[PDB]
Symmetry: C2
Subunit: 37 residues, 2 copies
């Protein structure tokens, strides 16, 4: 159903968003570490 | 309403997801460029 899908999607979108956030931090971390020396 | 929200959220989540994707690529691009020399 439409609703059932709306909820399901949100769950999948929420998890994916959390990952990108964490992954993005780690990436910027290693990159910022090299900039220093 | 619930539905109205479900749709709205999706739109916002879709856009944010597209950004992270592109931004992630650019980041890995500059990082991969340095790895080479």
């Amino acid at each position: 159903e439409k609703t059932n899908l709306e909820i399901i999607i949100l769950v999948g979108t929420a998890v994916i968003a959390m990952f990108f956030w964490l992954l993005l931090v780690i990436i910027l971390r290693t990159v910022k570490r090299a900039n220093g020396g």
